[PDB]
Design a protein around this ligand. Sequence first.
Ligand SMILES: C[S@@+](CC[C@H](N)C(=O)[O-])C[C@H]1O[C@@H](n2cnc3c(N)ncnc32)[C@H](O)[C@@H]1O
Ligand code: SF4
Ligand SMILES: [Cl-]
Ligand SMILES: [K+]
Ligand SMILES: [K+]
Length: 245
Amino acid sequence: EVIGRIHSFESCGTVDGPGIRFITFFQGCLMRCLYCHNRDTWDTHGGKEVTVKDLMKEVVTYRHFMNASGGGVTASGGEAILQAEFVRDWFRECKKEGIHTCLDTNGFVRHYDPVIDELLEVTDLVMLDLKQMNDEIHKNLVGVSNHRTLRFAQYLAEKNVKVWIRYVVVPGWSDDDDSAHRLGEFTRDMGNVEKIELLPYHELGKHKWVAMGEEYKLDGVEPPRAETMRRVKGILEQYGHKVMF
Ligand SMILES: C[S@@+](CC[C@H](N)C(=O)[O-])C[C@H]1O[C@@H](n2cnc3c(N)ncnc32)[C@H](O)[C@@H]1O
Ligand code: SF4
Ligand SMILES: [Cl-]
Ligand SMILES: [K+]
Ligand SMILES: [K+]
């Protein structure tokens, strides 16, 4: 049995529609986003050990609120794809229960072993972050190059996996016109992308950096103005996808 390492899990209403999402926050991430609102999910050796059986006992207590009309499970974190074998196993069991599955990922896939395709076969929706198309900025914002994530986005397109692209809009970092055009260009031909969703930067989770004795590097940065969200949305819309925030 594969052992999973989790930060926590929670049931919460879906953003829209009926039903609930049971979200497991996986422990461990290898990106370093300056904005991360879950800074305590980074350590790969932390969290709580769980089995798929353990986690399904929690999931099924919400069965009546997860249906085709809305609701399901989400693998988030942290970075769930670092535990691809466990998430594959979990989603396989969710499918046996008829539950919709969603992978919330940074796409930082460094090895293409068989487990990736197996996980995707039992994933109904991938919410992929594309954090910055400009790799010079991406390296300063996230600590790593965007190359692997971009290749994974192309892989998902090749496999026709249903995808929502998520773009966190941070003043001074990801609110500029050029970066928005680059994102529009890159995703234009990906017919598997149902929508691009802009997430406005928020300062929530600062306290988690302070607990760890680490400075929060976006002190003083405010959320983007509505005008900025509308401008980025308009730029992206020129490339043909549905765009929302
Ligand atoms: C905590 S991440 C976990 C999943 C995966 N590691 C990722 O980054 O996509 C879930 C979502 O929250 C976003 N997010 C993280 N910190 C944020 C912040 N300060 N403001 C707005 N969105 C943020 C991420 O970019 C991502 O879309
Ligand atoms: S990739 Fe996701 S969990 Fe990891 S540091 Fe960035 S926002 Fe946080
Ligand atoms: Cl990672
Ligand atoms: K934060
Ligand atoms: K994501």
